[PDB]
Amino acid sequence: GMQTTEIDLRLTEVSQQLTMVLVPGLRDSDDEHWQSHWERRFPHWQRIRQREWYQADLDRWVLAIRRELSVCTQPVILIGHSFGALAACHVVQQGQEGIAGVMLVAPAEPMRFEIDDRIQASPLSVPTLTFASHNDPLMSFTRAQYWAQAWDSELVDVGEAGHINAEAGFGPWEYGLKRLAEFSEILIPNR
Ligand SMILES: [Ca+2]
Ligand SMILES: [Ca+2]
Ligand SMILES: [Cl-]
């Protein structure tokens, strides 16, 4: 990457004070998925685990994120993909403490997973960044705009990026790391 060394230095400093938590969606994030690239690149970043990944169940994802937060010593940034991003949203909306910010990458339309009754179209109590594709099967761009506006999130148009997964080339996704660095630095307690 053109900006790799500067990305890594900046993110290494952010990590001295904030903890990144990776939240995958359905089936987990495979080895070539950006969340997995990022985990290998930043081995101190955290990642949720659970026994079953193949059934969308909001409460299981929420329970996994809660488990993860219970042992965090610093404020967390939740970095979600698809169903994982919905879970990140729901946990913040239900009033979970210890969250500095959330990054929602290709959040799914709640109806696709029959959780339209659990995700509110209302502001998230913390700073939020949302990345939306124009050819994501689970979320139209105009609906991404609707949700971002409702959630009071910044909306980052990544073009035709499919579902923002390995099959689409994400992948190392240095641009996501760059944006994360920008966003997270303003959340650091002592900068
Ligand atoms: Ca973990
Ligand atoms: Ca229904
Ligand atoms: Cl998903």
Q: How far is the CA of 2 from the centre of ligand 3 (A)?
A: 31
Asked whether the beta carbons of 7 and 1 are under 8 A apart, the reply is yes
- If we measure between CA atoms, which residue out of 71, 128, 72 comes closest to residue 105? 128
Q: Which two tokens stand for residue 120?
A: 């509110």
Closest CA to 113 of 146, 93, 83: 83
Q: Between the CA of residue 182 and those of 96, 106, 129, 140, 190, what are the distances in Å?
A: 24, 19, 11, 26, 15
Q: Of 79, 72, 69, whose CA–CA distance to 17 is shortest?
A: 72
38, 181 in Cβ contact below 8 A?
no
Q: Which two tokens stand for residue 49?
A: 């685990």
CA of 10 to the centre of ligand 3 (A): 29
Q: Are 84 and 106 in contact (CB under 8 A)?
A: no
HEC assignment per residue over 87-107: HHHHHHHCCCCCEEEEEEECC
Specify the experimental method: X-ray
Dihedrals phi, psi of 173, to nearest 5 degrees: 40, 65
- Can you give the residue ranges of every domain in the chain? 1-191
Which residue, chain included where needed, has tokens 């929602």? Answer: 104
User: In the block, which residue shows the tokens 């329970």?
Assistant: 63
How far apart CA 149 and CA 141 sit, in angstroms, is 12
Residue that has been written with the tokens 């996704």 in this structure? 173
Range list of β-strands (E), 82-161: 99-105, 128-132, 154-157
Ligand nearest to the CA of 67: 1
Between CA 32 and CA 119 the distance in angstroms is: 29
Tokens found for residue 177 = 């790391």
Do residues 18 and 184 make contact, with C-beta atoms less than 8 angstroms apart?
Answer: yes
Which parts of the chain are beta strand (E)?
Answer: 19-23, 46-47, 76-81, 99-105, 128-132, 154-157
The protein residues having their C-beta less than 5 angstroms from ligand 3 (an ion) are 25-26, 82-83
Helix or strand (DSSP H, E) at 62 = helix 58-70
> Which of helix, strand or coil describes residue 79?
strand
Is 152 marked as binding a ligand?
A: yes
Q: Could you tell me the distance, in angstroms and rounded to a whole number, from the CA of residue 161 to the centre of ligand 2?
A: 29
| Helical segments of the chain, H only | 4-15, 34-41, 58-70, 83-93, 141-151, 174-185
Hey, is 153 helix, strand or coil? coil
The answer to whether the beta carbons of residues 23 and 61 sit under 8 Å apart is yes
Closest CA to 11 of 167, 181, 155, 187: 181
**Radius of gyration (C-alpha) of the chain in whole angstroms:** 15
| Residue 104 contacts residue 153 (beta carbons within 8 Å) | yes
Q: What is the resolution of this structure in A?
A: 1.7
Superfamily of domain 1-191: Alpha/Beta hydrolase fold, catalytic domain (3.40.50.1820)
Pairing of strands 99-105, 128-132: parallel
* CA pair distance 133, 164, nearest whole angstrom: 7
Q: Do the beta carbons of residue 76 and residue 138 sit within 8 Å?
A: no
- Whole-angstrom Cα distance, residue 162 to residue 165? 7
Ligand nearest to the CA of 71: 1
